[PDB]
């Protein structure tokens, strides 16, 4: 499915719950190394909610895997992501994502 | 320089360090270089590392031929035929053969671009892993890069690597490379001229887009590059802030300093942006790419604005504003791109709504004076001011990104940076600083003022910075300076918007006074009737007779308030006219749009009545209670005006019908035909209907709305009257006659007649002539529409209007 | 020439038609810029009248028939007639570019044969003329913008990847993008679906912090060793993630151009740099990072010490964290010249030199730089070959250069 290296450990045990605010900084470049998005770069700390089904499945399950303050490389399967159809303009068809995601706070 | 020697050069800026130039020089008449400027001058020194350059016609003598299997020959009839490397253009992704032929010592490999060895030999890599000790850990790397040595040799495709030689197989194939790129690489020790020929398809399968790819071909894009020694390259303008010690050695740099780069992807190599000032082909091309990006998100494609924000990433544009050495073409390009992504939607919305002036009668809109004993940027104006909303371009979510509004940006940070830019530019470019930011004063000034103008429109710069920039320009300087043509052609719109904001302030004040005055004279009407033949003739005769037998009621309170307004009608008005005449008396003018804008501003100065003449019959007041529907209809009507200029237009008609159905369902549209007639929105919808015809469901959706607009008031019916001849020439078959029957253009024309006797008497004879020309039937069915319209044309009132 | 070659060949003018053709190209020449305005309008009005005389005779259709019957060869007849072929084609497409550029009526008359011209666009020999004709048509006819569809545009996107990189293609595509006054939005949806997503057909911009690379001033050719220590990291000076690199190289190979060498300058990017430092502690090599893990899983954070050793009699490099094994890195690599630690970064980061002041020394190798101070210098540190040097008076300069332990007695 998806295999995610913890780059840096956070606190290890604090993995979130459906109903807890997923305050995150993240970014990510493509498999080639070209960038496509950086929530770091516009200085907006991103928020979402697992269970409320806001993000793609790979990012959702990776946020489920991690802990508080855990910078990690969330390389995800393309068919878990947009993948074949792609994001029409941003992500080309059948491209594998490479992330850099660290959780910030939980509510 | 030579071997180990030191340079020491002074390109101006160094009058304090002129060792001998005040002695002789300046006295005779010479000059330093950078006496005026603040900038340095970058220097393109020579490099060391060789990068494979294209093949000019101006070689010594080495000349490739382009021959269709797809062969490229050589010839080097010279003396020195020894050291010439030849790397090829386009790479391999990580099946298809590639054969090399020699006519009579020759290396063949597959070079990855990280290669700059200028040596004539076979010269030059085994990384290890661990299972905390290893035990496999080693199948990693050998490439640094790739070497083999009439022969026919093939490095075929897939993934792995293949070494063959004339049908035989040479040993030691390096069939391990997961994600690299390779070039078909053959060096040369040319023992003779006519030394190479190059090439069940070929590499045309691998590189280009299509992969059935059975016929192979060298395209024109395939070059045959020669690894020449060096090119001039830039100078790394600000580098080092080392703090360190020597007992402890606290070596430390604390630098926020970033590059600005790109890479041509087809011959992959990273190149910094601001070196490209001499690479003129690449300059022109990347300029046109920015111009295309500006063309793409033109006027509403907000989904694509999210797409370009994924590409070019707005803080990169923020850094592109500041760079005081980036060329003027890139400067104009990125200054256009920041506008055409993040600003122009709300900007053009307010540019469309700059002639509406409607304002509620609440408490804030009431305490406004006239000009007392130059500041148009006041705290005022809740005058319906169509509000701004934005998006946040993440790329993980859904819902919906196609109606989402526009991407964001650091607003106040941006305006503070533009203030810094304007002030510092005005301080610099005044003494003929012989190096502007982009090369001339045009690329210096023009898009800065364009960005400042479009930002000034958007309702930012609260009043402190307004005062700052005004009496920066006013002092009562910017406009007093000497300027080129398109700079002041830009600035005329600033002066436009200043006078227009003055008009807005003027009209909001007169609405406040009209509220106070109507309260007083309404109570006077109450007491004048309660004292007791002049009954109301539809309340227009009442106000007309009040102002008519009060053309000098007639109380002295009334006369005092009349004199109050006619002294309201009574220092920019000086200086605008003075400077327009001053410009036109000296600087014989080209670009006749500049002449147009100048004299429109000049007449608009001398006709301050006339703006108040043609502004007041388009304003209106709302109670304050039903303001939310007014905001919603102004938003809907602004986006339908933007929908007017799509133009085609095949699937945004869903949005059109949704907007029209909301305009139907809005409450204010029922009771306020003054407002709807004042917006000119019937003519908007009608011209949309014009553009649809010279046949989808859009037409009847428009005609339904026109007919429902014809049935709310009599003066509305007068408004919808006069389009008869064009609406008639449209109405031949246009709708209603498979079985649709709800509305049609002819149905609209009949909808503007039915009530009024006056409009029945107003209409004339060649219209009916055209109707009976259209009565030229042979069978059929649709003649019922013509006869029905004539039935509504003849009778109308219980007895036929006989003429 | 459909069936035969004799005489050879036939009454078949070459220089007559080409002379008349250059005459007709010079006939419809646009009015100049340095002409008076009334004379400009005279020439322009007579030019539009002379075009409208040709539209109502269908001469352009005759030109199209000549295009039909000339596109045969690839360069025949008596082969001086086949030697003027490029000139005749070039002049015919220039003439076709002449007869449209002013009138809206003529580019409205080109509603028909546009797709056939997009078919002929892949002749891959004469893209200039067909491209300019197509551009001048697409400007002034809002009729033909309603015509053109997906496969045409996909061919035009492929046209650059045939013929390299032409700005004129982008002028064409911008003309398709926006009409005289308006746009066509689905067309632009098609553009950004079919050209951008993949970033290969054209350029792409990106910025990164300036990378600083330093060295302790001493060439070193005997199992070598050194020790450094990270003090403060704070890895987000800007939203760019920063980096720390530790490794060995020589200047004989890899001219160290910061930013202008390999990607971003950096470290582990050439055939002398052999870098270290990650979290998931692997390395770079040729600016390629493969993925050595180790049982520490830590960054180069604020309290970290790195064991650093170079190996004698085996061209091998293996580094450790507080002495603990990081699954040893390099074995059997290249040898030339004299080496040095090239420890590099790009951030607001301070570090130290533990080269005499020590903390840590294991006996996997032993030759620290403090145990090679002897030849000329004392313990000094410089900034990686420094083709610049910065001041505020005058940035002075430097010449290029003049650049083991087995000495040479006199062989007697």
Swiss-Prot record, chain A:
Catalytic activity: [protein]-peptidylproline (omega=180) = [protein]-peptidylproline (omega=0)
PPIase FKBP-type domain: residues covered: 19-107
Cellular localisation: Cytoplasm; Sarcoplasmic reticulum
PROSITE patterns for this protein: FKBP_PPIASE
Keyword hit for Cytoplasm: yes
Keywords on record: Cytoplasm, Isomerase, Rotamase, Sarcoplasmic reticulum
One Gene Ontology biological process: negative regulation of insulin secretion involved in cellular response to glucose stimulus
Reported tissue expression: Detected in heart muscle (at protein level). Isoform 1 and isoform 2 are ubiquitous with highest levels in brain and thymus.
EC number in record: 5.2.1.8
One MF annotation (Gene Ontology) recorded for this entry: peptidyl-prolyl cis-trans isomerase activity
UniProt keyword Transit peptide present: no
Activity regulation behaviour: Inhibited by both FK506 and rapamycin.
GO cellular component terms, A-Z: calcium channel complex; cytoplasm; membrane; sarcoplasmic reticulum membrane; Z disc
Matches recorded under PANTHER family: PEPTIDYL-PROLYL CIS-TRANS ISOMERASE (PTHR10516), PEPTIDYL-PROLYL CIS-TRANS ISOMERASE FKBP1B (PTHR10516:SF429)
Subunit structure: Identified in a complex composed of RYR2, FKBP1B, PKA catalytic subunit, PRKAR2A, AKAP6, and the protein phosphatases PP2A and PP1. Interacts directly with RYR2.
Family label: Belongs to the FKBP-type PPIase family. FKBP1 subfamily.
Function according to Swiss-Prot or TrEMBL: Has the potential to contribute to the immunosuppressive and toxic effects of FK506 and rapamycin. PPIases accelerate the folding of proteins. It catalyzes the cis-trans isomerization of proline imidic peptide bonds in oligopeptides.
Name of the featured protein: Peptidyl-prolyl cis-trans isomerase FKBP1B
Species for this entry: Homo sapiens
Encoding gene (name): FKBP1B
